[PDB]
Ligand binder design. Structure first.
Ligand SMILES: NC(=O)c1ccc[n+]([C@@H]2O[C@H](COP(=O)([O-])OP(=O)(O)OC[C@H]3O[C@@H](n4cnc5c(N)ncnc54)[C@H](OP(=O)(O)O)[C@@H]3O)[C@@H](O)[C@H]2O)c1
Ligand code: SF4
Ligand code: SF4
Ligand code: SF4
Lengths: 88, 206, 147, 176, 296, 106, 111, 75
């Protein structure tokens, strides 16, 4: 069971907190541009995720031109990051 | 002499030329007294103009000093005029050390050396801290070596070594560190001063 | 009855095993405190860890001279410390002002700011003598909370 | 004298450019820097555990103060106030009174450990060689009162170290 | 189902007994002696740190905002321990339908552990430094997904059990020569304190050092293998542990040998320099199964 | 080739000649009876003769500098500022300020 | 004239007035930003007793130096500086404090 | 100006170290009321914040009476 496996880890993690809790008795907007680019790149990663699991039944010649195409534009988005990104 | 003498005088006459050269200009505004002893030159300056003396020695065709590096002050209560701010200057191109002194009591403000020398402002803060001499037209006059809740000026010979506010208790108040307590351990005042005069020629007639 | 007496020593053994000191670089003493890291004389991972940190550390070594400017500064560090805290006044300046003392700025005794449990008398406190300060601290922990 | 720190362009053309680019493309010099600590790990560490092993010292070393005495009884300290005035910390205090009849040797003799920056000046200024600095490390107290030395007594209790002092002073007369 | 407890209790001991390795192996690098007084070779110290911090050490919170601060260590320890479940090993506990997707997911959610700690403190002084620590982890997770896919596109599906079978004769270090160099650096971003560094505070140590072993094991699956042997589980168990231990030495190697890269120039190593390099190798790894037949 | 200082070593001759001829005129505006003009002029005229005789030689730069032309150009650059400050504030020409109190010996 | 200082006689008095306004506005601000300590009203009473000891005025030279010092010890709060309720505190907390009388001081025996 | 004397008198009487009935209108704060050189001018600073106008150092020296202060308040 996956449900039994996950819940056992969290319940033991909660118990460790109580041990320390119960027993003893006596600005800058330049960071934002980095965070946004993380999200926009990971969505291109999300489109490029199926590649090892997808390419099994589909035609290779039709895929080859389209598979590289996403990575090329992923570099063009980084090419726009070279024309003055900032001090970061 | 082999071990008794440190160095024979040879450059003393060469350094005495500086004692004439600056004095050849002869300003009552600047020059006054020129003293030269033990391969070193000492000049004291009239309070009215200190900046024009410091612009001199800086650059100049005959002698190039540039570095107006180290800055001291003397506390002495014998004279009618109390403090004596002493400038120690060094040359890199010329390789010589000359001294600039002030004779004024300087409880009243004195002209600053900030426009001529960049690092002079940090030393000027120390003189206002320890001695209490204000510099006119000074940028950022802030306390460095003194405490934030310190009264008076810590170096002046008028008050004791221990001070007035020095001991800091904690005791009764949970967070506030104490200040008004004044008592300290007894510093033994030594009265060791030798009878008979130490050296001839230094004796002054009353 | 027997289990009560033996369990108390086990908690005391935990502090006898490891002690994390504060790295105060406020002295010439602090250079000798860096000789505790120097391999020839080591308490490093024998008990001492040089990670320090203002909150996680159990021990704080007041290294040498303290001025009236640092008197409120060192006090707030002591409040951030956990309840099992031991303060070592390593150096003659920390004991009661080795030099200076009668001076205006230097605080006498350190106990006027922060209470001291272990005193180390040495100016250049030799690493050999510094090894006693930690070993005595481990020996001093004997009994805590009877009832 | 001049030595020069600047390399002044190590790369020129083709062969000299590629190897300077190779260290920045991958790492190489970081892997070479990894090898420095690698051999440093294998070689034996110089470590001394204090409760069993002891560190190196010298015949002349200054620690905790202890005043010596003559081989046939008698306190070696003559009371001068000599060591009092030389003391840069003013840790040592001395008030002297005549001992019973004839002899005049001390009454008050306190050396502060709250003060004292350890010079060996009091060892040097002493003409009779009373305060001799012994190889001492062990001193740890709960209070200032327990730390600052009383009227001789604990200083005279340095007999446990005076056997070493007598051996160390034999390397001191006609210095080294 | 008893095996889950046989993958938490010996694992919590492995994070505990790291304290020996993290300053004795690091010690000989710095020519200093580590643990020696406490035990015979200092074996009593790792368990002694637990008695010190858990029971006796009290709490002094800055504000304690109802649910938070006493919830962040649960997310820290919980996500670090759940990462052990999808691990292939000789035999995995409850094998997922897709392996590596679960591995990347629980690591991307492990960013929250350093996020909620920044929200725990009321002061503005701490949160600016806290967001900077998020930036160290969030940025490298972009590349971590790319370098993973290039290894997968060479051979095998997302399942971690298939990654052992594909390494039968030769290791994956040789075909993925520049990609293996990336996993030495990219893993150190997740609070390892080697290229960049920022009661319940003690619980973060038990979670952060747990991820260090986790990245050591995960590198020894994607790049190491040597042999499988289904008939003999004895030969695989010993040989896997030695390979993982050698990578643990390299993790402590960077911590001692090399200074911090600066936060600004961490974004010059990555993004400016690494992201054009990783994608160019990703472009190369798309063509590889098409140029020569290589499909699972 | 470049100097060790922040000031860029630029190949420029007669640049030293312009600045040294400019400062001579400034000295002959207000002070005339003063010794400041009478002493500084003969040093500058001695230096100008070395520039005219030696054409771009390192030996000319070695005379009373020995740190290339870049260091010698800095000596001329602040010379105009020093002469203008001496002309503005009267000290060399006039001497009438009060004498100090009679005490010097410590 | 000699020496200048900053102001001449009558001008020096109005420099104290400008200094008084700047310090009067900071004592309500140094409760929320700093600490509660005692009181806002009692903090303003500490201002008036400080200027009473300084009240003499015989020469502008003495007055001008008090302005520069007044723009320093009372400036230790405006630009936000560390004190932690220990520095810049003028009033005695642990004072006995002693009184001036021939019956009170003589009973304790001092000097 | 209409309704200016009523706004200034309400703030002045409510303030500490001042008589509520003895001193009102035309009478000087330093001469008739009985206040120090720094204390009298400090009361004028509190009235400036309530009205909503900043007062210069030059104009503060001349003003003392509330009747004279009402004329200076108008802008
Ligand atoms: N605000 C109020 O509560 C209030 C109001 C009105 C009057 N008062 C008066 O003010 C006083 C307040 O004192 P407190 O309550 O603050 O003191 P406390 O905290 O109880 O401290 C007393 C200490 O003395 C020790 N002690 C006392 N009797 C002992 C015994 N028989 N054996 C061993 N150890 C003993 C205890 O040590 P162990 O813990 O190690 O045993 C304890 O640490 C009271 O005496 C009360 O009359 C208080
Ligand atoms: S005790 Fe000695 S070594 Fe230590 S801080 Fe003081 S002067 Fe320096
Ligand atoms: S210790 Fe030596 S110098 Fe000092 S009083 Fe005794 S005999 Fe004299
Ligand atoms: S060692 Fe120095 S400071 Fe100590 S008692 Fe002797 S003279 Fe005084």
């Amino acid at each position: 069971n996956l449900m039994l496996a996950l819940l056992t880890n969290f319940t033991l993690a909660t118990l460790l907190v109580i041990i320390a809790f119960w027993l003893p008795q006596l600005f800058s907007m330049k960071f934002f541009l980095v965070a946004i680019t993380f999200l926009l790149f990971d969505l291109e990663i999300a489109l490029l995720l199926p590649l090892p699991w997808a390419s099994q039944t589909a035609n290779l010649n039709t895929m080859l031109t389209m598979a590289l195409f996403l990575i090329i534009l992923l570099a063009v988005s980084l090419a726009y990051e070279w024309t003055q990104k900032g001090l970061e | 002499r082999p071990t008794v003498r440190p160095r024979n005088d040879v450059a003393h006459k060469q350094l005495s030329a500086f004692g004439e050269y600056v004095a050849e200009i002869l300003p009552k505004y600047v020059q006054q007294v020129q003293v030269s002893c033990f391969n070193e030159l000492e000049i004291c300056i009239h309070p009215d103009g200190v900046i024009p003396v410091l612009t001199f020695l800086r650059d100049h065709s005959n002698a190039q000093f540039k570095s107006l590096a180290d800055l001291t002050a003397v506390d002495i209560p014998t004279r009618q005029n109390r403090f004596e701010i002493v400038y120690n200057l060094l040359s890199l191109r010329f390789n010589s050390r000359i001294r600039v002194k002030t004779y004024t009591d300087e409880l009243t403000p004195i002209e600053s050396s900030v426009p001529v020398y960049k690092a002079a402002n940090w030393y000027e803060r120390e003189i206002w801290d320890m001695f209490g001499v204000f510099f006119a037209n000074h940028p950022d006059l802030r306390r460095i070596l003194t405490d934030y809740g310190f009264e008076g000026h810590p170096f002046r010979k008028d008050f004791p070594l221990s001070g007035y506010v020095e001991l800091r208790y904690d005791d009764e108040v949970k967070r506030v560190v104490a200040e008004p307590v004044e008592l300290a351990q007894e510093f033994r005042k030594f009265d060791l001063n030798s009878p008979w005069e130490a050296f001839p020629a230094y004796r002054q007639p009353p | 009855e027997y289990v009560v007496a033996k369990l108390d020593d086990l908690i005391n053994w935990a502090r006898r095993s490891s002690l994390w000191p504060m790295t105060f670089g406020l002295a010439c003493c602090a250079v000798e405190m860096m000789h505790m890291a120097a391999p020839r004389y080591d308490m490093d991972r024998f008990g001492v860890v040089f990670r320090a940190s203002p909150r996680q550390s159990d021990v704080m070594i007041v290294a040498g001279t303290l001025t009236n400017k640092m008197a409120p500064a060192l006090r707030k560090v002591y409040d951030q410390m956990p309840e099992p805290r031991y303060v070592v006044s390593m150096g003659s300046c920390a004991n009661g002002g080795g030099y200076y003392h009668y001076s205006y700025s230097v605080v006498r005794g350190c106990d006027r700011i922060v209470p001291v449990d272990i005193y180390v008398p040495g100016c250049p406190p030799t690493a050999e003598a510094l090894l006693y300060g930690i070993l005595q601290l481990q020996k001093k922990i004997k009994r805590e909370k009877r009832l | 004298t001049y030595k020069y720190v600047n390399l002044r362009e190590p790369s020129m053309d083709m062969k000299s450019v590629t190897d300077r680019a190779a260290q920045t493309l991958l790492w190489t010099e970081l892997i070479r820097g990894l090898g420095m600590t690698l051999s440093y790990l294998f070689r034996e560490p110089a470590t001394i555990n204090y409760p069993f092993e002891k560190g190196p010292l010298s015949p002349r070393f200054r620690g905790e103060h202890a005043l010596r005495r003559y081989p046939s009884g008698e306190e070696r300290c003559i009371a001068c106030k000599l060591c009092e005035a030389v003391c840069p910390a003013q840790a040592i205090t001395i008030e002297a009174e005549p001992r019973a009849d004839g002899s005049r040797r001390t009454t008050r003799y306190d050396i502060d450990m709250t003060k004292c920056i350890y010079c060996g000046f009091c060892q040097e200024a002493c003409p009779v060689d009373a305060i001799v600095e012994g190889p001492n490390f062990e001193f740890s107290t709960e209070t200032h009162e327990e730390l600052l030395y009383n009227k001789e007594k604990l200083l005279n209790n340095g007999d446990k170290w005076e056997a070493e002092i007598a051996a160390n002073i034999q390397a001191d007369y006609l210095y080294r | 189902m008893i095996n889950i407890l046989m993958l938490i209790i010996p694992i919590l001991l492995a994070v505990a007994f790291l304290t020996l390795v993290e300053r004795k192996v690091l010690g000989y690098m710095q020519l200093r002696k580590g643990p020696n007084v406490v035990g015979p070779y200092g074996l009593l110290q790792p368990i002694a740190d637990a008695i010190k911090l858990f029971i006796k050490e009290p709490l002094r919170p800055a504000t304690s905002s109802a649910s938070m601060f006493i919830l962040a260590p649960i997310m820290a320890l919980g996500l670090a321990l759940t990462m052990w479940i999808p691990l292939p090993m000789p035999y995995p506990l409850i094998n997922m339908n897709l392996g590596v997707l679960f591995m990347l997911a629980m690591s991307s959610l492990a960013v929250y552990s350093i996020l909620w700690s920044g929200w725990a403190s009321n002061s503005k002084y701490a949160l600016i430094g806290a967001l900077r620590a998020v930036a160290q982890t969030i940025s490298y997770e972009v590349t971590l997904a790319i370098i993973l896919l290039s290894v997968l596109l060479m051979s095998g599906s997302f399942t971690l059990s298939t990654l052992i079978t594909t390494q039968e004769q030769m290791w994956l270090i040789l075909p993925a020569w520049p990609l293996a160099m990336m996993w030495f650096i990219s893993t150190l971003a997740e609070t390892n304190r080697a290229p960049f560094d920022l009661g319940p505070f003690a619980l973060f140590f038990m979670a952060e050092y747990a991820n260090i072993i986790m990245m050591n094991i995960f590198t020894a699956i994607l790049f190491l293998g040597t042999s499988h042997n289904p008939h003999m589980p004895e030969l695989y168990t010993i040989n896997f542990t030695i390979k993982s231990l050698l990578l643990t030495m390299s993790f402590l190697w960077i911590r001692a040998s090399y200074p911090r890269f600066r936060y600004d120039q961490l974004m010059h190593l990555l993004w400016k320099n690494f992201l054009p390099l990783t994608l160019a190798l990703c472009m190369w790894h798309v063509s590889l199964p098409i140029l020569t037949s290589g499909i699972p | 080739t470049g100097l060790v200082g922040l000031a860029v070593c630029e190949t420029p001759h007669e640049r030293l000649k312009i600045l040294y001829t400019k400062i001579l005129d400034v000295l002959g505006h207000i002070p005339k009876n003063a010794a400041y003009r009478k002493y500084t002029e003969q040093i500058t005229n001695e230096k100008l003769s070395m520039v005219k005789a030696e054409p771009d030689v390192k030996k000319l730069e070695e005379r009373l500098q020995g740190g290339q032309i870049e260091e010698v150009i800095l000596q001329a650059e602040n010379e105009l500022s020093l002469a203008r400050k001496m002309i503005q504030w009267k000290p060399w020409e006039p001497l009438v300020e009060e004498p100090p109190a009679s005490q010097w010996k410590w | 004239v000699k020496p200048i200082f900053s102001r001449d006689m009558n001008e020096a008095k109005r420099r104290v007035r400008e200094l008084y306004r700047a310090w009067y506005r900071e004592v309500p601000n140094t409760v929320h930003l700093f600490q509660l300590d005692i009181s806002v009203k009692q903090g303003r009473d500490k201002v008036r007793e400080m200027f009473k000891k300084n009240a003499h005025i015989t020469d502008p030279r003495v007055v001008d130096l008090l302005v520069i010092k007044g723009k320093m010890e009372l400036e230790e709060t405006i630009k936000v500086w560390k004190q932690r309720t220990h520095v810049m505190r003028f009033f005695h907390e642990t004072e006995a404090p002693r009184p001036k009388d021939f019956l009170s001081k003589f009973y304790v025996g001092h000097d | 100006l209409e309704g200016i004397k009523d706004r200034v008198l309400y703030v002045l009487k409510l303030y500490d170290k001042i008589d509520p009935e003895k001193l009102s209108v035309n009478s000087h704060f330093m001469k008739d009321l009985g206040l120090d050189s720094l204390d009298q001018v400090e009361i004028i600073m509190a009235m400036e914040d309530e009205f909503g106008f900043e007062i210069p150092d030059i104009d503060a020296e001349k003003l003392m009476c509330p009747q004279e202060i009402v004329d200076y308040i108008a802008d």
